[PDB]
């Protein structure tokens, strides 16, 4: 209880969250046509955080994104900026 001589609860059940390599922030973006969206990522290689200069981005594993779009926000993290977004065309079940 915030106000007064409150007793602490017991602790919640412990929750473990073990992370996986490679970070996307954000993990997902839901947007409309004509907007601007940007993603940031960190790539962990053998318990080491790689420099942002090394990081390269790809779309749907088909092709490399042009270098002009990349921006080096920081030494560890790289960012891609998209402009004048067009509707995502669905491939099979996948809408995105």
């Amino acid at each position: 209880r915030l106000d007064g001589p409150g007793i602490w609860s017991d602790w919640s059940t412990p929750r473990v969250f073990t992370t996986q390599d490679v970070i996307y922030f954000p993990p997902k973006i839901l947007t409309s046509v004509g907007s601007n969206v940007s993603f940031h990522c960190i790539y962990k290689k053998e318990n080491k955080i790689v420099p942002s200069k090394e990081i390269v981005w790809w779309m749907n594993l088909a092709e490399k994104i042009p270098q002009s779009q990349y921006d080096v926000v920081s030494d560890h993290v790289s960012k891609v900026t998209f402009f004048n977004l067009n509707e995502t065309k669905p491939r099979g079940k996948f809408t995105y």
Binding site: Q20, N60, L61, A62, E63, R91, G92, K93, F94
Partner: protein, 146 residues
């Protein structure tokens, strides 16, 4: 059992699976030879010299394809089974005893990749399958051995 007909049918089933994968537009844009980390268990282009190797390769592919909910993929798994059976009859016509390949015992790991990234598993499995089938088709005239 006509040996020549069986050989031609084996050729046909391989081309059949390759063409099926060709119809799948997202797979076409993906490099077959390219290595992707984590997917290493999938039998991609690594020299498949012999019939027993082909059988185990197809078995693993069948096991992976069976788990993914897609109408096209279930059939591809079935086609792989028939291909394995064709290889077994060829090995019989060649007086070879092919043991029935089990899939990978090590599927306790595949669940993680299927849950986290379905797309990667599907595109990689299909593109590597297409590559493996293409070298198998090339080698089937070279007088494959057991």
């Amino acid at each position: 059992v006509p040996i020549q007909k069986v050989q031609d049918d084996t050729k046909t089933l391989i081309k059949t699976i390759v063409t099926r994968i060709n119809d799948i537009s997202h797979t076409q844009s993906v490099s077959s030879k390219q290595k992707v980390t984590g997917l290493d268990f999938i039998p991609g282009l690594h020299p498949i010299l012999t019939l027993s190797k082909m059988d185990q390769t197809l078995a693993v592919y069948q096991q992976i394809l069976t788990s993914m909910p897609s109408r096209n993929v279930i059939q591809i798994s079935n086609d792989l089974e028939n291909l394995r059976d064709l290889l077994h009859v060829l090995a019989f016509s060649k007086s070879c005893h092919l043991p029935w390949a089990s899939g990978l015992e090590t599927l306790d790991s595949l669940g993680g990749v299927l849950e986290a990234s379905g797309y990667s598993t599907e595109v990689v499995a299909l593109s590597r399958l297409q590559g493996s089938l293409q070298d198998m088709l090339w080698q089937l005239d070279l007088s494959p051995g057991c």
